[PDB]
């Protein structure tokens, strides 16, 4: 696949393409060297570095604003920033008492805001101009991952905590869910129904397993399930990321096995499994129309510090894999 020119210097945690509101395609990557980097992508597959910004700590999540003018950055330095791309100046918009692991834009009919989720077991909501969070919600444990598609948010915590929120008028807890997964939670991603309404989510575990959860299906015991993935004595690797093709509703997973795989949760099939890379695949995402699949190959720490080679190269790869994720 296609390599991004001028990759980050340490391991990449997060990737986020630009919204449909911008012409073309711009990719954002966060890294363990504390940087957020923005590459323009062109139909040729060539990529152009456009701008960068740095935290005083590793960058754990990133996301855009729906109009495309801002990039949001959440970092181990216990803050998050709003980066205005035009002026190329960034300011702090959020403060936490611990690293900020997740960050998301909420475009609702009555309010817009940034949602940050932190290892300080809090969930904060920000208007981007006030130093005061407009809302603070308490988590049972430390935030490990989340995803947002109005009017729904999902948040997984440590101790297999798993919560769903409603976002109409103002955010508020909707229901706590007994986790379907037996092991540590790492990734999550919301999927939608035929009517384009958020309807459930897929949940990745460290135990080579993904759970599909519908919020309100007719027969939960049949309609909800878990499948095995990212295993090669069978070896079991962690699942580091998950994303739904924005058009087909199929999905991709990437795991510490250094592979990626495509899936159809309605047919319950594996559509594709790539070959093994040198390193674990630590993140991934789709462009706004699903014509581009982007994944990052970096050490994820899934075997401790001893196996960390800081002189090994960190790669972001691009794949035009729209057809490979169509179902039959």
């Amino acid at each position: 696949d296609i390599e991004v020119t001028s990759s980050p210097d340490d391991s990449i945690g997060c990737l986020s393409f630009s919204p449909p509101t911008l012409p073309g395609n711009f990719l954002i990557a966060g890294s363990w060297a504390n940087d957020v980097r923005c590459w323009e992508v062109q139909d040729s597959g060539q990529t152009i570095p456009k701008a960068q910004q740095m935290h005083t700590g590793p960058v754990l999540d990133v996301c855009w604003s729906d109009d495309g003018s801002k990039v949001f950055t959440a970092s181990c330095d216990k803050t998050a920033k709003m980066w205005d791309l035009s002026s190329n100046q960034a300011i702090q918009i959020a403060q936490h008492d611990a690293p900020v692991k997740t960050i998301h834009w909420i475009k609702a009919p009555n309010y817009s805001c940034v949602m940050t989720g932190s290892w300080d077991k809090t969930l904060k909501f920000w208007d981007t101009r006030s130093s005061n969070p407009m809302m603070v919600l308490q988590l049972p444990e430390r935030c490990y991952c989340a995803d947002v598609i109005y009017p729904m948010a999902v948040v997984a915590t440590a101790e297999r905590g798993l919560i769903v929120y409603q976002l109409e008028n103002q955010p508020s807890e909707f229901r706590r869910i007994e986790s379907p997964l037996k092991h540590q939670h790492r990734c999550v991603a919301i999927f939608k129904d035929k009517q384009n309404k958020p309807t459930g989510f897929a949940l990745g575990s460290i135990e080579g397993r993904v759970a599909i959860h519908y919020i309100n299906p007719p027969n939960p015991a049949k309609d909800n399930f878990t499948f095995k993935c990212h295993r090669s004595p069978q070896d079991i690797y962690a699942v580091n990321g998950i994303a739904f093709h924005p058009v087909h509703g199929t999905l991709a997973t990437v795991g510490s096995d250094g592979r990626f795989s495509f899936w159809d949760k309605d047919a319950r099939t594996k559509l594709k499994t790539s070959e093994q890379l040198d390193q674990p695949i630590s993140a991934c995402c789709f462009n706004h129309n699903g014509n581009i699949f982007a994944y990052a190959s970096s050490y994820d720490w899934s075997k401790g510090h001893e196996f960390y080679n800081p002189q090994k190269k960190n790669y972001i790869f691009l794949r035009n894999a729209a057809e490979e994720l169509k179902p039959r």
């Binding site: 399930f225 499948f227 095995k228 899936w263 319950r268 099939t269 594996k270 559509l271 499994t273 490979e324």
Partner: peptide, 10 residues
């Protein structure tokens, strides 16, 4: 890249 059925947990 052949399409197989998922290894589901039973």
């Amino acid at each position: 890249d052949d399409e197989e059925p998922m290894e589901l947990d039973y």
